[PDB]
Amino acid sequence: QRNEEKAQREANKKIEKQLQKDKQVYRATHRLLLLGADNSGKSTIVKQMRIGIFETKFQVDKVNFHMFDVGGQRDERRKWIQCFNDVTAIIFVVDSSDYNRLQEALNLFKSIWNNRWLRTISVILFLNKQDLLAEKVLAGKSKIEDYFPEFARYTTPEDATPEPGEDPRVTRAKYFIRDEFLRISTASGDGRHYCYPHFTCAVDTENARRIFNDCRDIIQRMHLRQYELL
Amino acid sequence: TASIAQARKLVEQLKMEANIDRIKVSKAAADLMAYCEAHAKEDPLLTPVPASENPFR
Amino acid sequence: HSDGTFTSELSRLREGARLQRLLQGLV
Amino acid sequence: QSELDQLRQEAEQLKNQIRDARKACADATLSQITNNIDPVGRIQMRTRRTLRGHLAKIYAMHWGTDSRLLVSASQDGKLIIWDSYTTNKVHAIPLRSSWVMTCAYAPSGNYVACGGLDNICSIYNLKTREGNVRVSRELAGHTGYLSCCRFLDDNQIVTSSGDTTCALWDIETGQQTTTFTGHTGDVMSLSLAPDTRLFVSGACDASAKLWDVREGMCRQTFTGHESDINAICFFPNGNAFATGSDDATCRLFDLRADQELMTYSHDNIICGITSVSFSKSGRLLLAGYDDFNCNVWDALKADRAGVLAGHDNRVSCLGVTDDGMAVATGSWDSFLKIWN
Amino acid sequence: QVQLQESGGGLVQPGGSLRLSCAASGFTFSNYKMNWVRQAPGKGLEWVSDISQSGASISYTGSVKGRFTISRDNAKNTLYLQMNSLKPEDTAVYYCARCPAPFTRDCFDVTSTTYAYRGQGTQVTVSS
Amino acid sequence: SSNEKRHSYLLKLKVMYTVGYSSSLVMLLVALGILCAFRRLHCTRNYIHMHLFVSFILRALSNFIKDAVLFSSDAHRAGCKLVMVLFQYCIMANYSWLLVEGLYLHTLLAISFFSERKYLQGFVAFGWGSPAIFVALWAIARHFLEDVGCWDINANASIWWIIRGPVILSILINFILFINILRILMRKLRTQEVSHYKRLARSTLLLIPLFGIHYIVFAFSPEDAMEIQLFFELALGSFQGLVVAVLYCFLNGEVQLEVQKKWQQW
């Protein structure tokens, strides 16, 4: 017909210019995979990120982030997790005040860190509910050494900035919990991805900025690895 | 409670698969042989097609 | 820049050299 | 309570009965019956086209009955209908949910289907008169991610989900008309029989199940794999099928002898199969892998016959045309490659 | 078919020892990282111990470190958990779990409610 | 009798920088070919590498043309003046693309949340069109205020400053960006120790050729060391392209993998 073909080329022109308009939007927005447990408190975290699967959109310094709380799937996650091998970061929320379940968080971390399709994604680790851990430590009725026998031989590390007016046992507890994840993070993460641990509670307002800063750091290290400068 | 019905359904669905009519594996392989040997001529990947009829070249 | 400085210097020197050869030939 | 004990021993009794019945028909092997056939040699195929335009990983790809048009799903939110002859983009559909894991092209060509982590199967009208490609319908009712969907006609679609169940729908009404249960893991793949009267399914429990569509029961169950089954595809005559798994092997099963006919594996292959497909004759078995390339197997001697090594990332999906001339391969490198 | 049958376990008084065994079949045992998980009456499935393919790497939940000892016999396709000083908080159903994929260090979903490659479990009732 | 010292010195300098620009032209041609003949390498950084490689090739070719027209054995005034204008433009373009590459990496590590392809337009426009403005203004000032023979002798300082100020600013700004980039990288290594210093030194020695950092040594230098100044730059900054090419095309991982593909699986 030799006329159909140029109409096809015109449709292709329109489609491809729309596609390159959409590529600017796709590459300007950063996708975050929000993982956690029923007790971790991801709902309150996304309640701080004001502005089958749930999405929240927030903006920090005119940069757009889309965080995907998968939610309505059954408990097995080894297949759909692969759908997130491209995200900027995995935001991993942990209920730090629940020692009995901490070992199930660590293992989950240990499997996210070591998964073939997630072995380059960085994990922004939010140790949530710090006030609960504080009151549980000061109550004294719950011993971290009962669940983790390596807490008796542990001391507050050197680069450990405590909060003002904080009891030192609380500091030992929270930094031991953080170092439990950091050991997994360092045992296999060879500069290709890093864990960014933060201590947060349910009333903190600066979580979006923390994710913004960790995402900036991830991008900068990707650029510094492109140039073979690091 | 639920595991009872689970196991019962499992065993019943398993035995309802047992009264199927099976053949020998010899026939099950000869059938595939005969199919891929009868339809061998019209497979443009097994026997490559020259650029005259090939639309993707 | 340095290419320009080399060019200026070599040009000036060989100009002076041609002038000097003319001065020998004429005097 | 002896109820669980006696049901346990009843299940073991008749399960081992089925084991010996499967055993009481294995007179020989497919390898020794095809011990005299001719090898196909070395299947050399080249990248004829390379389709570009997807921004993110390609997760699914269905080949139209046109044997020319493609639909491809990428996890950036785009269904791109494609003309493979001219590499032109007929359509580009923006999706509501970016995380699509499957796509389907109606055998009549009027509608496409896609669904992912939103648990909804979206059907889009391609042949509208008012001049737009809009959402024809949203099939909701799964409680897990939708991993595969296939049209039986322009009114009925069968979709498999991560909630361990398959569902045959009625698109005009939007109501699920049949539910196929029995899998104990995520259902990953679907494959319809030539007459679309049966369909076989593979789940994340190392098991495949044959279902009758109209009644809604499971006819046969096949085991033999060691890990999750990622992809299933029928044999062109519909009396066999092939499964690809995370245990780095492929297996050909028969529907009449009811047991694994053949296994396609190699020691140098320790990555999982992501997709499989048969050539129009059934002599070649295409299998996409995690090692970034596809492998062409002689489906009767199990010796690998060729390699399709042109992709930079994980090979998601394979598709052989109805006429058997081309082989589309999608991948996580965002590029579709036609081979011939 | 993939099959994991557990043996051992039963009645012991606090301070007793038990050898839980897990006979594997239907797959290559030397490829998969193995796990012991448990479910005590009235709560969810919890991970107890794990051992890698060859058997060098080994880990425990922490409330069993020093008391439980995991050990695989690849040449015999068997997994073992030896428990020396049993406390009352160890009475539970004990399942032998396999890792999902055959050459990985990460094992997802082993403590899932209906994970497919898990055994039926042995009841270990520790009471005096 | 004097000035034979400087004449022989400049002739040997000519021999050596001819060798240098020849080797750099060869290697930059090979590198541009490898960067363009592989579509997987078509980054936004490799695009700027290609433009820098083009600027280096133009610098070398323009030096060859200027030599063949001027120092190889009153008409042809226009042709000679246009050769000199082309020469100055190519030199200034190489300096501007060194500055553009420094600015790209710095804005990539100091903002890192920006539309790269919208920045690419302004970066290429600046790199190829800031040379043009200054070289055109210099040629105008020469045609008007100092028009003697070919425009190959810089005898008026101001007319020469018009085209030497921009180059000095390029060098200084690119050095500042070099320092800030290394500060950022030291923070990256330190925050989140002998191997730290070793990696920092390696990333300094790989970043010196690509930014034109060896020019800050003899920027702001008296006429007393001019000779050795020339020597250094002309005898070694004529190999700069070469080493640059080599690294940013031959010791790269992405390039090596992509070329190994087509070489080995044919």
PDB file of C-alpha atoms in Angstrom, chain F residues 33-158:
ATOM      1  CA  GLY F  33      35.712   4.571  17.584  1.00  0.00           C
ATOM      2  CA  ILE F  34      35.312   2.148  20.479  1.00  0.00           C
ATOM      3  CA  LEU F  35      33.043   4.561  22.375  1.00  0.00           C
ATOM      4  CA  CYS F  36      30.764   5.120  19.383  1.00  0.00           C
ATOM      5  CA  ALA F  37      30.703   1.540  18.020  1.00  0.00           C
ATOM      6  CA  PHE F  38      29.080   0.191  21.209  1.00  0.00           C
ATOM      7  CA  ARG F  39      25.561   1.282  22.143  1.00  0.00           C
ATOM      8  CA  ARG F  40      25.697  -0.087  25.703  1.00  0.00           C
ATOM      9  CA  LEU F  41      28.350   2.532  26.540  1.00  0.00           C
ATOM     10  CA  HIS F  42      26.153   5.433  25.354  1.00  0.00           C
ATOM     11  CA  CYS F  43      25.968   6.997  28.804  1.00  0.00           C
ATOM     12  CA  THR F  44      25.830  10.690  29.615  1.00  0.00           C
ATOM     13  CA  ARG F  45      29.427  10.502  30.902  1.00  0.00           C
ATOM     14  CA  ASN F  46      30.698   8.631  27.836  1.00  0.00           C
ATOM     15  CA  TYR F  47      28.967  11.248  25.683  1.00  0.00           C
ATOM     16  CA  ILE F  48      31.040  13.966  27.356  1.00  0.00           C
ATOM     17  CA  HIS F  49      34.085  11.717  27.002  1.00  0.00           C
ATOM     18  CA  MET F  50      33.382  11.595  23.265  1.00  0.00           C
ATOM     19  CA  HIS F  51      33.138  15.381  23.069  1.00  0.00           C
ATOM     20  CA  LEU F  52      36.397  15.755  25.025  1.00  0.00           C
ATOM     21  CA  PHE F  53      38.051  13.246  22.688  1.00  0.00           C
ATOM     22  CA  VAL F  54      36.847  15.293  19.717  1.00  0.00           C
ATOM     23  CA  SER F  55      38.321  18.434  21.278  1.00  0.00           C
ATOM     24  CA  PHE F  56      41.672  16.681  21.773  1.00  0.00           C
ATOM     25  CA  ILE F  57      41.662  15.441  18.171  1.00  0.00           C
ATOM     26  CA  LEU F  58      40.862  18.954  16.960  1.00  0.00           C
ATOM     27  CA  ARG F  59      43.720  20.359  19.053  1.00  0.00           C
ATOM     28  CA  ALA F  60      46.225  17.888  17.583  1.00  0.00           C
ATOM     29  CA  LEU F  61      45.025  18.302  13.988  1.00  0.00           C
ATOM     30  CA  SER F  62      45.040  22.078  14.354  1.00  0.00           C
ATOM     31  CA  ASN F  63      48.616  22.034  15.638  1.00  0.00           C
ATOM     32  CA  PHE F  64      49.615  19.976  12.594  1.00  0.00           C
ATOM     33  CA  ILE F  65      47.832  22.386  10.234  1.00  0.00           C
ATOM     34  CA  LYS F  66      49.345  25.459  11.896  1.00  0.00           C
ATOM     35  CA  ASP F  67      52.836  23.955  11.709  1.00  0.00           C
ATOM     36  CA  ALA F  68      52.480  22.991   8.044  1.00  0.00           C
ATOM     37  CA  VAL F  69      51.163  26.444   7.135  1.00  0.00           C
ATOM     38  CA  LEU F  70      53.549  28.586   9.207  1.00  0.00           C
ATOM     39  CA  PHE F  71      56.849  26.815   9.958  1.00  0.00           C
ATOM     40  CA  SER F  72      57.207  24.882   6.690  1.00  0.00           C
ATOM     41  CA  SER F  73      59.180  26.846   4.081  1.00  0.00           C
ATOM     42  CA  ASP F  74      52.176  38.766   0.977  1.00  0.00           C
ATOM     43  CA  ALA F  75      49.164  36.977  -0.476  1.00  0.00           C
ATOM     44  CA  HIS F  76      47.383  34.181   1.407  1.00  0.00           C
ATOM     45  CA  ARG F  77      46.854  36.689   4.216  1.00  0.00           C
ATOM     46  CA  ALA F  78      43.230  35.591   4.621  1.00  0.00           C
ATOM     47  CA  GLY F  79      44.038  31.875   4.522  1.00  0.00           C
ATOM     48  CA  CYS F  80      46.805  32.262   7.100  1.00  0.00           C
ATOM     49  CA  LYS F  81      44.681  34.400   9.422  1.00  0.00           C
ATOM     50  CA  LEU F  82      41.846  31.867   9.195  1.00  0.00           C
ATOM     51  CA  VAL F  83      44.286  29.062  10.007  1.00  0.00           C
ATOM     52  CA  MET F  84      45.357  31.016  13.091  1.00  0.00           C
ATOM     53  CA  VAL F  85      41.731  31.603  14.111  1.00  0.00           C
ATOM     54  CA  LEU F  86      40.954  27.896  13.701  1.00  0.00           C
ATOM     55  CA  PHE F  87      44.059  27.090  15.754  1.00  0.00           C
ATOM     56  CA  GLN F  88      43.096  29.361  18.641  1.00  0.00           C
ATOM     57  CA  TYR F  89      39.538  28.023  18.559  1.00  0.00           C
ATOM     58  CA  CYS F  90      40.642  24.389  18.745  1.00  0.00           C
ATOM     59  CA  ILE F  91      42.997  25.086  21.660  1.00  0.00           C
ATOM     60  CA  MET F  92      40.358  27.041  23.568  1.00  0.00           C
ATOM     61  CA  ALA F  93      37.808  24.304  22.839  1.00  0.00           C
ATOM     62  CA  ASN F  94      40.034  21.643  24.374  1.00  0.00           C
ATOM     63  CA  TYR F  95      40.385  23.803  27.482  1.00  0.00           C
ATOM     64  CA  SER F  96      36.632  24.440  27.618  1.00  0.00           C
ATOM     65  CA  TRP F  97      35.856  20.734  27.369  1.00  0.00           C
ATOM     66  CA  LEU F  98      38.294  19.932  30.162  1.00  0.00           C
ATOM     67  CA  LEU F  99      36.370  22.512  32.194  1.00  0.00           C
ATOM     68  CA  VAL F 100      33.028  21.031  31.093  1.00  0.00           C
ATOM     69  CA  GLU F 101      34.094  17.570  32.223  1.00  0.00           C
ATOM     70  CA  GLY F 102      35.186  18.903  35.598  1.00  0.00           C
ATOM     71  CA  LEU F 103      31.870  20.749  35.919  1.00  0.00           C
ATOM     72  CA  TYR F 104      29.919  17.637  34.943  1.00  0.00           C
ATOM     73  CA  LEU F 105      31.529  15.415  37.560  1.00  0.00           C
ATOM     74  CA  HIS F 106      31.261  18.146  40.198  1.00  0.00           C
ATOM     75  CA  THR F 107      27.567  18.819  39.555  1.00  0.00           C
ATOM     76  CA  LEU F 108      27.047  15.050  39.514  1.00  0.00           C
ATOM     77  CA  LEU F 109      28.610  14.675  42.981  1.00  0.00           C
ATOM     78  CA  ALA F 110      27.474  17.970  44.526  1.00  0.00           C
ATOM     79  CA  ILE F 111      23.830  18.055  43.491  1.00  0.00           C
ATOM     80  CA  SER F 112      23.197  14.514  42.161  1.00  0.00           C
ATOM     81  CA  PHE F 113      19.441  15.181  41.892  1.00  0.00           C
ATOM     82  CA  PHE F 114      19.110  16.923  38.533  1.00  0.00           C
ATOM     83  CA  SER F 115      17.927  16.312  34.974  1.00  0.00           C
ATOM     84  CA  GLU F 116      21.122  15.162  33.271  1.00  0.00           C
ATOM     85  CA  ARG F 117      19.810  15.338  29.709  1.00  0.00           C
ATOM     86  CA  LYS F 118      18.578  18.900  30.165  1.00  0.00           C
ATOM     87  CA  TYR F 119      22.004  19.761  31.575  1.00  0.00           C
ATOM     88  CA  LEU F 120      23.678  18.048  28.612  1.00  0.00           C
ATOM     89  CA  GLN F 121      22.344  20.651  26.171  1.00  0.00           C
ATOM     90  CA  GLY F 122      23.822  23.578  28.083  1.00  0.00           C
ATOM     91  CA  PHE F 123      27.063  21.698  28.710  1.00  0.00           C
ATOM     92  CA  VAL F 124      27.659  20.937  25.025  1.00  0.00           C
ATOM     93  CA  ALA F 125      26.592  24.455  24.026  1.00  0.00           C
ATOM     94  CA  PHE F 126      29.043  25.974  26.511  1.00  0.00           C
ATOM     95  CA  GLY F 127      31.869  23.603  25.604  1.00  0.00           C
ATOM     96  CA  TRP F 128      31.659  24.264  21.867  1.00  0.00           C
ATOM     97  CA  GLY F 129      30.509  27.879  21.942  1.00  0.00           C
ATOM     98  CA  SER F 130      32.435  29.672  24.651  1.00  0.00           C
ATOM     99  CA  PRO F 131      35.615  29.091  22.602  1.00  0.00           C
ATOM    100  CA  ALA F 132      33.836  30.632  19.619  1.00  0.00           C
ATOM    101  CA  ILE F 133      32.908  33.884  21.368  1.00  0.00           C
ATOM    102  CA  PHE F 134      36.401  34.583  22.697  1.00  0.00           C
ATOM    103  CA  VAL F 135      38.203  33.490  19.521  1.00  0.00           C
ATOM    104  CA  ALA F 136      35.890  35.644  17.405  1.00  0.00           C
ATOM    105  CA  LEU F 137      36.450  38.642  19.676  1.00  0.00           C
ATOM    106  CA  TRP F 138      40.214  38.061  19.497  1.00  0.00           C
ATOM    107  CA  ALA F 139      40.121  37.826  15.694  1.00  0.00           C
ATOM    108  CA  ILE F 140      38.084  41.042  15.557  1.00  0.00           C
ATOM    109  CA  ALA F 141      40.531  42.852  17.850  1.00  0.00           C
ATOM    110  CA  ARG F 142      43.401  41.617  15.679  1.00  0.00           C
ATOM    111  CA  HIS F 143      41.785  42.689  12.408  1.00  0.00           C
ATOM    112  CA  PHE F 144      41.183  46.118  13.935  1.00  0.00           C
ATOM    113  CA  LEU F 145      43.876  46.901  16.499  1.00  0.00           C
ATOM    114  CA  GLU F 146      46.850  44.683  15.611  1.00  0.00           C
ATOM    115  CA  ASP F 147      46.961  43.411  12.019  1.00  0.00           C
ATOM    116  CA  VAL F 148      50.502  42.393  11.091  1.00  0.00           C
ATOM    117  CA  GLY F 149      51.289  39.482   8.756  1.00  0.00           C
ATOM    118  CA  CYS F 150      49.783  36.233   9.839  1.00  0.00           C
ATOM    119  CA  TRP F 151      48.329  36.534  13.335  1.00  0.00           C
ATOM    120  CA  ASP F 152      51.037  34.261  14.742  1.00  0.00           C
ATOM    121  CA  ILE F 153      53.022  36.688  16.937  1.00  0.00           C
ATOM    122  CA  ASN F 154      51.536  37.898  20.219  1.00  0.00           C
ATOM    123  CA  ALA F 155      53.102  41.343  20.590  1.00  0.00           C
ATOM    124  CA  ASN F 156      50.203  43.195  22.259  1.00  0.00           C
ATOM    125  CA  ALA F 157      49.435  41.823  25.717  1.00  0.00           C
ATOM    126  CA  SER F 158      45.793  42.924  25.923  1.00  0.00           C
TER     127      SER F 158
END
